[PDB]
Ligand binder design. Structure first.
Ligand SMILES: *[C@@H]1O[C@H](CO)[C@@H](O)[C@H](O)[C@H]1NC(C)=O
Ligand SMILES: *[C@@H]1O[C@H](CO)[C@@H](O)[C@H](O)[C@H]1NC(C)=O
Ligand SMILES: *[C@@H]1O[C@H](CO)[C@@H](O)[C@H](O)[C@H]1NC(C)=O
Lengths: 49, 50
């Protein structure tokens, strides 16, 4: 996903989340929505499963 | 000087508070920031780590 980084200030680790790495071709069973906003330098994340 | 029978409003009753409690935090708290003081390597002064 990248080669290397140079310099930065912010590094945050959120709560752990479990995933399934198996990929199938069946019908979907869940819907995930995400909203990303940027007001006055503040990034906003809204989501619900 | 002469007051007749009836209701006359004179002033207002104010309940002044007696105590003032303020509590922003619950306990001691800290977010990870010691990595800039505990990094593997640092930066120079011509280009310093903001
Ligand atoms: C604040 O800390 C106290 C004591 O550790 C805890 O009982 C309380 O739930 C905390 N409040 C939070 C994390 O909002
Ligand atoms: C840096 O690391 C050392 C050893 O792990 C530790 O004793 C120290 O508290 C850390 N922080 C600073 C500011 O030196
Ligand atoms: C450190 O990061 C700041 C921005 O956060 C940048 O201005 C500066 O050039 C960086 N220093 C180095 C040595 O990359």
């Amino acid at each position: 996903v990248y080669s290397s980084a140079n310099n930065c200030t912010f590094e945050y680790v959120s709560q752990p989340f479990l995933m399934d790495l198996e990929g199938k071709q069946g019908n979907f069973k869940n819907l995930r929505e995400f909203v990303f906003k940027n007001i006055d330098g503040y990034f906003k994340i809204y989501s619900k499963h | 000087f002469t007051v007749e029978k009836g209701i006359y409003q004179t002033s207002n009753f104010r309940v002044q508070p007696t105590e003032s409690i303020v509590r922003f935090p619950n306990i001691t708290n800290l977010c990870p920031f010691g990595e800039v003081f505990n990094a593997t390597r640092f930066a120079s002064v011509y280009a310093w780590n903001r």
